[PDB]
Design a protein around this ligand. Structure first.
Ligand SMILES: [Mg+2]
Ligand SMILES: [Zn+2]
Ligand SMILES: [Zn+2]
Lengths: 49, 52, 76, 1166, 99, 89
């Protein structure tokens, strides 16, 4: 994963239980972004028709 | 029985393809209004001939 | 004695009867011959059994039936 | 008025044995062939398990041959192959049959534990089976010769007997024999004869069995079932669509297991007819008959003989019994669960901006959820031509649909639910707020009710389709409408963590800070002083405030004054609505206090102001906690400076005692105890060291040299406020943590010397690991235990609902404070709160009635009783309620999410069980199994024996296994002598008088005793006090009520003593009995009234007895229940919750109570 | 996941995802109890009848939802309806009395 | 929106029968046979009905009365229609 700047302090209850409040700097830098590779299939079968 | 050892068993996953979707069933009921109004549009005899 | 599971209650129930001697088979078969031929003879002694066969063959040559549905063939 | 013939809205249900002709009545054709489908054209072979003629057309409104394909031709039976062209659904309906050649026993009535054919004929099981397998001959209608009727013979015996008696003697074998037995049976004659025999001889062993059997007989007679029907002449076949052959991908077919079985049965049966027409020898046809019996049995219920296996697969084929029973213990689909449309779910987030009456919902989710509403509303306004085009629009997600969605969402509530549903608050209604994202936003204050963390917990959403559901959700399931736990009147909306740290940090006072000792006009300029940075949030300051008191009659008094308070408290006071006094906010505001604030506010201003108040409290809590800059560093945790010294001294003690063991001054075990004691004491010392330090060590100066107050340190504020953390965990952070104990439970004498702030080495951590694993394991286990407990509880209560308004009985239990040991483990005010007085109570002087008769005691009444010294109040309870088949609201109490008295029709049994069950995860002989034992009313291991009757006692006889105890009453006789084993140390004085229910020994006692000897109120008191002793010791708040309703359900059954209507020893409903004796005291017999004795049945035992059999089939063993009901021809009228839930109609409670009532009275009347 | 009206199981008519279009959430015994504790009868009925198990009620509902009428004409759940046939398939006669 | 139903609960005591009555009325509005007795805020029939309960102008008594009256309002219309059915004899 990726290390990053963290501050411990309640921020307007947005961190309420375990909840995590992250800046836009992270989503902009595309660091925590992930690439998914999905394999999709198409089957050509034989029906009595 | 399929995986998980659970009550999931093969047949429980076999979907009914013979049923019709409600999304279409509402249209089948709606078309009957459309052709009805549109048939109210023509002359009574044209409507009789077309309905026939 | 009864363990349930009818495989057993069968397997044991049949095992009582003793195997036949090579002669006993002939004895039994002879008894068969006696019985049968008895009923055949009893059939031959009935007038209606004859007259019926005649009435049937009159329908055989009349094309209302076939020779296969009456006789399987004679002693010939 | 012609009653009816065809479909109506049906009531009750009936169950009984099936006649051959009745079986045929269902059957629309006889399946004559094992074949299924043609193998090429997949059409059904005629007269087979799958058939068009007998059952139904393959495709909708079309004949098999294909002649009539038109929807017009409908009631037409085709000339080619008769198939009436009708919907394919009828192939899911129409049943069938098979005519069996040889008679066949129905395995459910052969192998049921009390074998029905067996006890009906008064014949043993092994005999009957021995007869069924052709292993022996049995007599029928023996007549007068040599032999009994039920007597069993053998080959040779039967032969000899027959040789002696040709006629006037009868014996058969096989299924035909048992059938002949059952058919020849005359029940009435047996009734007469058995009544006589009952009346003649006097022996317990005789007339016990006698009366049991006659009762059984006459019951079976009154049923309408004739014994012959236990033997199947005809075998019904289940509709094909319920056991489908339906194809799959790759041209592969999949079919149920009922086809293998049915096919087998058909095969063997037909082969039997064949063997009959071939005149086969006896042995062969016998083998075939047996095989047929086995096949049929395997079809009905498999596993009671051979466990037959499916084709090519080892796994035993599933029979009809397994089809009914289901799986997962006892779960019948309306139990385990059911899939539901118009729903969704996802990960959840915070959303503090939300009001507590609402919540966030993902856009896309709301779109897909409300899709039909969106369509209809789209074309209602005219944006879409037809429904099709509407679908195209929402599918394209055109910009115009979002507004329409905003329309359909507005006043339309949605239901939110979590995974571990325990109490009713597990599901709550909210107003949807459209949010961009895939996550569900859930209001923080409600996070307590769900027990939901933010660590990835998911929530599910359901849409209240029907109008009634919308209003139900809004007026009941709504968040704002439940602010109070149903278990106790304390608010469940209590602020959680961040917010309470905010309000705590706000109101608090440091010794010196900006604006110290100044004065301000009002909270406005106090806040204005703070925000500008001129004054500090916490400083001691006098400010003028205007507080209101509503103490006038329905009217707010206004008064002003200069209060000595802090800046923060002044700022916070702005929020506090109306008639609340300033005192409430003048304190330090801990979690408890901040809760009591909301509480008082609710018991003063009402609902709405409490709601808005709570909201504001959350908002300000978050804001000021944010501004606070509260954080946690490594230096925030302070270790005692004297720690190492305590460690070393306590470490000297161990070598002291060690040297003593070396010299032999002390034994090994005593040494162990010594060292363990010194280490424990050490831990206590370091704990109370770091506590004092971390707590008061802040030393600060005001205008002088020095002074010291409670610390402003972060971790302390967190633990002290109640936001999170506690002395226990803080102790483990700074000071050493405990001593650990090996899995055996032997506690290690080398405790963990280090802590988390310091490092733990290899050993210490390894030793901690076991504690961790046992922790997770134990907790994860107690969750399941709790679940099982709640299950038994709801099963035993359920249908108990408030029905009648007031039974009007002076009866009730005496409510005193708990007063255990030293001072007051729980007050009187809490025990009597929200309850209703049985009768008026006095002052020290009398003819002054404070609380009249029966009145709800609310906060004012209870404080009025607190003003006066009254220590004693008699209170109406649900256990003593005179109302039969339910509780009157006047008996129950006011408790609910609302402060008003309990509503008519609310189902209390359920909520009671839920209330008892929710805390059950928080419970540690004692413990949770102790609770389970209590409700099960299990007699303990080493109990105590109470005195049977009052009066002087003495020790009788001598030692054999027991030394008899002879009781001697004052007036009445003294036949009573109890045999008490003398190897148990006694208590009772040989020369003293003992009241009934005194201590004749020590140890716990079975509540059966307490009920019988000490009385009903006594036993209910014992149960409630003991279970409350278990919960309260853990810190769990549960009102006595719920426990009391469970208790009432426990004692529902009682055993009669006297006679004059029903049987002597019968255990029966005290409702039935009390209603019958109250009715028999007048009219009828002048007074014949029979005495009973209250019985105590355990919860799991009392759950067994339910009128409705459909209900019993749910949680009990299905196989037995269905039979045992079917023999008596039991008629289930519904009337309960569970049954109506299964059958799928409105619940006879809640909203539906207006239905079932207006019905129930219409029934059995004009 | 979200679902309004999807496919249905053949053996017993119940919501089942066949398209990767997900079957609805499972409403269990505990959730049912949660409804029972409140006074909501109609929410429960609509939950286990029209929204799920009723082969008629679902569609008859849908038409009303789009028509702008919120009601239900519940009928009998297909589960219990099958249970009747399974019980009656044995030597047990189960009937529905009165009116 | 209606945040708390407490006021309606004040107007009719039972609180389940509140749901029932408000339901019936909300239906009277939703399948239109009638119009609101109080200004619609864009509130759906669900909430409008509750507002009608809170104002004390709608409850079980009032509804039953109105309906009973309407039965005769129709009887008056069909008065000459059904009496023309004398062919029954
Ligand atoms: Mg969690
Ligand atoms: Zn045909
Ligand atoms: Zn009562």
């Amino acid at each position: 994963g990726q290390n990053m700047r963290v501050a411990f302090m309640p921020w307007n209850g947005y961190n309420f239980e375990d909840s995590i409040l992250v800046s836009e700097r992270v989503v902009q830098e595309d660091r925590f972004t992930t690439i998914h590779i999905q394999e999709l299939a198409c089957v050509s079968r034989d029906t009595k028709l | 029985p399929i995986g998980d050892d659970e009550d999931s068993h093969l047949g429980d996953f076999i979907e009914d393809t013979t049923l019709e979707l409600p999304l279409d069933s509402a249209t089948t009921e709606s078309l009957r209004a459309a052709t009805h109004d549109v048939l109210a549009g023509l002359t009574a005899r044209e409507a009789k001939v077309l309905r026939m | 004695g009864r363990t349930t599971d009818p495989v057993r209650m069968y397997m044991r129930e049949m095992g009582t009867v003793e195997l036949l001697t090579r002669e006993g088979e002939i004895d039994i078969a002879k008894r068969i011959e006696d019985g049968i031929n008895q009923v055949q003879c009893s059939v031959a002694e009935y007038p209606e059994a004859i007259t019926y066969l005649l009435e049937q063959y009159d329908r055989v040559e009349a094309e209302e039936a076939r020779l296969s549905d009456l006789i399987t063939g004679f002693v010939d | 008025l012609k009653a009816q013939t065809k479909t109506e809205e049906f009531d009750a249900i009936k169950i009984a044995l099936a006649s051959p002709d009745m079986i045929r009545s269902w059957s629309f054709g006889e399946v004559k062939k094992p074949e299924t489908i043609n193998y090429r054209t997949f059409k059904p072979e005629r007269d087979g398990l799958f058939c068009a003629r007998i059952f139904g057309p393959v495709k909708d409104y079309e004949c098999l041959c294909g002649k009539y394909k038109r929807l017009k031709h409908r009631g037409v039976i085709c000339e080619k192959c008769g198939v009436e062209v009708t919907q394919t659904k009828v192939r899911r309906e129409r049943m069938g049959h098979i005519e069996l050649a040889s008679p066949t026993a129905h395995i459910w009535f052969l192998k049921s534990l009390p074998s029905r054919i067996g006890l009906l004929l008064d014949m043993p099981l092994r005999d009957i089976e021995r007869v069924l397998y052709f292993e022996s001959y049995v007599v029928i209608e023996g007549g007068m010769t040599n032999l009994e009727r039920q007597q069993i013979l053998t080959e040779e015996q039967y032969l000899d007997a027959l040789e002696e008696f040709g006629d006037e003697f009868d014996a058969k074998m096989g299924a035909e024999a048992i059938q002949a037995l059952l058919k020849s049976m005359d029940l009435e004659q047996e009734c007469e004869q058995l009544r006589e025999e009952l009346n003649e001889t006097n022996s317990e062993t005789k007339r016990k069995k006698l009366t049991k059997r006659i009762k059984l007989l006459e019951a079976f007679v009154q049923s309408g079932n004739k014994p012959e029907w236990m033997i199947l002449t005809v075998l019904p076949v289940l509709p094909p669509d319920l056991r489908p052959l339906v194809p799959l991908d790759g041209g592969r077919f999949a079919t149920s297991d009922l086809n293998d079985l049915y096919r087998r049965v058909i095969n063997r049966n037909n082969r039997l007819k064949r063997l009959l027409d071939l005149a086969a020898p006896d042995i062969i046809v016998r083998n075939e008959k047996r095989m047929l019996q086995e096949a049929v049995d395997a079809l009905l219920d498999n596993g009671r003989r051979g466990r037959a296996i499916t084709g090519s697969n080892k796994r035993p084929l599933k029979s009809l019994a397994d089809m009914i029973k289901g799986k997962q213990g006892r779960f019948r689909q309306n139990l385990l669960g059911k899939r539901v449309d118009y729903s969704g779910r996802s990960v959840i987030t915070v959303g503090p901006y939300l009001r507590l009456h609402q919540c966030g919902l993902p856009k896309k989710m709301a779109l897909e959820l409300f899709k039909p509403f969106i369509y209809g509303k789209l074309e209602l306004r005219g944006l879409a031509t037809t429904i099709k085009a509407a679908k195209k629009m929402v599918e394209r997600e055109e910009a115009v649909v979002w507004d329409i969605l905003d329309e359909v969402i507005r006043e339309h509530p949605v239901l939110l639910n979590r995974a571990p549903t325990l109490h009713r608050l597990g599901i709550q209604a909210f107003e949807p707020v459209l949010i961009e994202g895939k996550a569900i936003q859930l209001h923080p204050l409600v996070c307590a009710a769900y027990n939901a963390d933010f660590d990835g917990d998911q929530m599910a959403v359901h849409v209240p389709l029907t109008l009634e559901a919308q209003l139900e959700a809004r007026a009941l399931m709504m968040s704002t409408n439940n602010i109070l736990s149903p278990a106790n009147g304390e608010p469940i909306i209590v602020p959680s963590q961040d917010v309470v740290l905010g309000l705590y940090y706000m109101t608090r006072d440091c010794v010196n800070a900006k604006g110290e000792g100044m004065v301000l006009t009002g909270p406005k300029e106090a806040e204005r002083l703070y925000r500008s940075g001129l004054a500090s949030l916490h400083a001691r300051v006098k400010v003028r405030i205007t507080e209101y008191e509503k103490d006038a009659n329905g009217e707010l008094v206004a008064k002003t004054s200069l209060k000595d308070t802090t800046v923060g408290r002044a700022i916070l006071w702005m929020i506090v609505p109306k008639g609340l006094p300033y005192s409430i906010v003048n304190q330090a505001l801990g979690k408890k206090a901040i809760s009591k604030m909301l509480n008082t506010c609710y018991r003063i201003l009402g609902l709405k102001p409490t709601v808005i108040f709570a909201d504001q409290i959350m908002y300000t809590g978050f804001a000021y906690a944010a501004r606070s800059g509260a954080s946690v560093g490594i230096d925030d945790m302070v270790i005692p400076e004297k720690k190492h010294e305590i460690i070393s001294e306590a470490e000297a003690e161990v070598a002291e005692i060690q040297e003593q063991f070396q010299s032999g001054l002390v034994t090994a075990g005593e040494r162990y105890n010594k060292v363990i004691d010194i280490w424990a004491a050490a831990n206590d010392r370091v704990s109370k060291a770091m506590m004092d330090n971390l707590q008061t060590e802040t030393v600060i100066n005001r205008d002088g040299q020095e002074e010291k107050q409670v610390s402003f340190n972060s971790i302390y504020m967190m633990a002290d406020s109640g936001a999170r953390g506690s002395a226990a965990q803080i102790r483990q952070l700074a000071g050493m943590r405990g001593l650990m104990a090996k899995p055996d439970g032997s506690i290690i004498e080398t405790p963990i010397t280090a802590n988390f702030r310091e490092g733990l080495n290899v050993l210490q951590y390894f030793i901690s690991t076991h504690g961790a694993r046992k922790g997770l394991a134990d907790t994860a286990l107690k969750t399941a235990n709790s679940g099982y407990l709640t299950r038994r509880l709801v099963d035993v209560a359920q249908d108990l609902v408030v029905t009648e308004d007031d039974c009007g009985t002076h009866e009730g239990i005496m409510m005193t404070p708990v007063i255990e040991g030293g001072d007051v483990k729980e007050p009187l005010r809490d025990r009597v709160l929200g309850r209703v007085t049985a009768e008026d109570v006095l002052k020290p002087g009398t003819a002054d009635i404070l609380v009249p008769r029966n009145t709800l005691l609310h906060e004012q009444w209870c404080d009025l009783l607190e003003e006066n010294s009254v220590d004693a109040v008699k209170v109406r309870s649900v256990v003593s309620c005179d109302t039969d088949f339910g509780v009157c609201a006047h008996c129950y109490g006011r408790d609910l999410a609302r402060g008003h008295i309990i509503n008519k029709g609310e189902a209390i049994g359920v909520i009671a069980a839920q209330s008892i069950g929710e805390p059950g995860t928080q419970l540690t002989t004692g413990g949770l199994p102790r609770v389970a034992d209590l409700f099960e009313a299990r007699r303990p291991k080493e109990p105590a024996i109470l005195a049977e009757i009052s009066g002087i006692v003495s020790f009788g006889k001598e030692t054999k296994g027991k030394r008899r105890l002879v009781i001697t009453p004052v007036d009445g006789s003294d036949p009573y002598e109890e045999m008490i084993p003398k190897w148990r140390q006694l208590n009772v004085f040989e020369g003293e008088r003992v009241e009934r229910g005194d201590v004749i020994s020590d140890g716990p006692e079975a509540p059966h005793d307490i009920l019988r000897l000490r009385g009903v109120h006594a036993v209910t008191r014992y149960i409630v006090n003991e279970v409350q002793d278990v919960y309260r010791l853990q810190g769990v708040k549960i009102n006595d009520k719920h426990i009391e309703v469970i208790v009432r359900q426990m004692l529902r059954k009682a055993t009669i003593v006297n006679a004059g209507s029903s049987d002597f020893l019968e255990g029966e409903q005290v409702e039935y009995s009390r209603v019958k004796i109250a009715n028999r005291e007048l009219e009828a017999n002048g007074k014949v009234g029979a005495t009973y004795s209250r019985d105590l049945l355990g919860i799991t035992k009392a759950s067994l007895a339910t009128e409705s059999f459909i209900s019993a089939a749910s949680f009990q063993e299905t196989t037995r229940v269905l039979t045992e009901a079917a023999v008596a021809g039991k008629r289930d009228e519904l009337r309960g919750l569970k049954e109506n839930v299964i059958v799928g109609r409105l619940i006879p409670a809640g909203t539906g109570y207006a239905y079932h009532q207006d019905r129930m009275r219409r029934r059995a009347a004009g | 996941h979200a679902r309004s009206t999807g496919s249905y199981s053949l053996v017993t008519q119940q919501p089942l995802g066949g398209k990767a279009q997900f079957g609805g959430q499972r409403f269990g015994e505990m959730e049912v109890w949660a409804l029972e504790a409140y006074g909501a009868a109609y929410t429960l009925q609509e939950m286990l009848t029209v929204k799920s198990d009723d082969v008629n009620g679902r569609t008859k509902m849908y038409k009303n939802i789009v028509d702008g009428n919120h009601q239900m004409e519940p009928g009998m759940p297909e589960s219990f309806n099958v249970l009747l046939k399974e019980i009656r398939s044995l030597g047990i006669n189960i009937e529905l009395e009165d009116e | 929106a209606r945040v708390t139903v407490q006021d309606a609960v004040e107007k009719i005591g039972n609180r389940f029968d509140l749901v029932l009555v408000a339901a019936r009325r909300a239906r009277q509005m939703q399948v239109g046979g009638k119009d609101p007795l109080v200004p619609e805020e864009n509130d759906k029939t669900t909430v409008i009905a509750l507002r009608e309960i809170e104002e004390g102008l709608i409850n079980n008594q009032i509804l039953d009365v109105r309906e009973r009256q309407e039965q005769q309002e129709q009887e008056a219309a069909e008065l000459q229609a059904v009496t023309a059915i004398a062919e029954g004899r």
